[PDB]
Symmetry: C2
């Protein structure tokens, strides 16, 4: 296993008054070395209650972030929990929430969980192992659903949180969480981690993903804090690595398609050694991102 | 990638008059090293025409076994093609069959493909790479469907093939193909390969899988030849490796449960070094099979 979710230990990092990141203890070390880190989350606390960002893969990690949240919110109720995407490491813990907490997710997330949780769980067991808590998961879909391209505001008392679908960034029901007074943005999987981590273009939706992340970059103020899906907080300029990588792949694949190169020749040509460093580079880049983008842009 | 389906090259190996195995060229080498081999298939020919076993992952591999079948069947028509399970490496090639070929598969396979082929493809791209022909696959379900626990016979002229659902061994729609004259049985994934390859208990259904393989063992004559899903032919006694492994896991887990051991100490205790050899042992045994069996037997 590249990442053993039974070995992740969640810690609290205060970002501002009432605003916290939930981070694996080894996440800073792994991101610096280009490793693969566990899921990041967070907590925003207002005057009357709190909002949890991500509910984690399993009961163990859910219990850890719930314990952190009790200290962070000092007894105020958990009013909301947000899933940035359907991916189980961000959403499987929904089942362990109690009243009065309401789940916020995209309508696409709800549709997918409703129809396919069983095969999603099978996939997660295959890649992250059995006995990591996935088998126990039952479906708990959202209460408040953000439609495609939509946004909603949530008032926690004195703090109003923005939950925004900027467009396709990984799944098609990707939500960003924006806390405008501390200027903290949670991206979920849409931003994996700081450099040298790479985006995963699972469906080859390169053009959409680049446009979405450009909109996020243009939206954020220069002093914003970004909490990536699998990394520790970073500054707004940390996004440029991802924007440059996607723009380089887009320019290379478009040029390949204009010259009518085969897929194999395109993969051979777009080695892009200047973007290496990620421990998974030699899989994500030539065995997923480049061929998937080629196949997708073939039809555009 | 543990196995690159773009590098597999299928070969013909005759087992009897009109009975051929379709085996990757390196399957014998890989089985002897405890490696991970590509999908095995086969062909049975009577006076009326031929039956193809497994339609393979992609167009390249489908075309290879179709070319072999044209020589093996000496111009006779391809009357049938059988999918032993829904797994794409056994069935994705269905879409490329032409008239008059009829597909035989389980009703469970048809139901899974109808509801979840898109998810299945996404899983196969993640774990076997993009650009390996999975993206091109469209659904083509069976003409003749075997109900759960059912069986059907097919007369090819001078040869009658038995297609049998012996019970749950991998997916719940697992079909075995039995040719009583040559005494050849195809198992699909229900038997991965000869020793040291291990069963994959993806659902933890240990008792059911052991019972199914025991029934197959009791069914076969002592001079039967088995074509496993991912290996070269085995003798009937080669099943005892898999039967003994599953019985050992069941005894170990049952005794751990009765002593009130946690999942983590059951994994630590069930090292079972006498069943080593598989290059995937350190994953499939402690990270899939032992935990999944523990969780499946937990409430009996
Ligand atoms: Zn994630
Ligand atoms: Zn599905
Ligand atoms: Zn297989």
């Amino acid at each position: 296993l590249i990442l053993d979710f039974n070995k992740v230990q969640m810690r609290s990092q205060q970002l501002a008054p009432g605003v916290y990141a939930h981070l694996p203890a080894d996440s800073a070390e792994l991101n610096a070395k280009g490793g693969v880190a566990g899921t990041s989350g967070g907590l925003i606390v207002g005057t009357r209650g709190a909002m949890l960002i991500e509910t984690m893969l399993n009961r163990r990690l859910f219990d850890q972030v719930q314990a952190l949240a009790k200290k962070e919110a000092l007894g105020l109720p958990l009013l909301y929990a947000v899933n940035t995407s359907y991916h189980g490491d961000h959403s499987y813990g929904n089942m362990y929430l109690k009243a009065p907490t309401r789940v916020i997710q995209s309508t696409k997330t709800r549709d997918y969980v409703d129809g396919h949780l069983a095969d999603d769980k099978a996939f997660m067991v295959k890649n992250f192992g059995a006995g990591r808590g996935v088998e126990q998961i039952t479906a708990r879909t959202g209460d408040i659903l953000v439609p495609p391209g939509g946004r909603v505001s949530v008032d926690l008392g004195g703090k109003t949180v923005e939950i925004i679908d900027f467009g396709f960034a990984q799944t098609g029901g990707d939500l960003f969480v924006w806390e405008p007074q501390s200027k903290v943005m949670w991206t979920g999987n849409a931003v994996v981690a700081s450099k040298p981590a790479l985006p995963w273009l699972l469906d080859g939706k390169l053009v959409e993903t680049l446009a979405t992340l450009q909109k996020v970059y243009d939206f954020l103020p220069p002093d914003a804090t970004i909490v990536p899906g699998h990394g520790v907080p970073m500054a707004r300029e940390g996004l440029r690595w991802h924007l440059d990588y996607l723009a380089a792949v887009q320019a290379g694949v478009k040029d390949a398609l204009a010259r009518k190169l085969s897929l194999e020749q395109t993969v051979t040509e777009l080695k892009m050694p200047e973007f290496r460093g990620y421990v998974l580079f030699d899989f994500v880049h030539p065995d997923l991102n480049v061929p998937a983008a080629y196949e997708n842009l073939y039809f555009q």
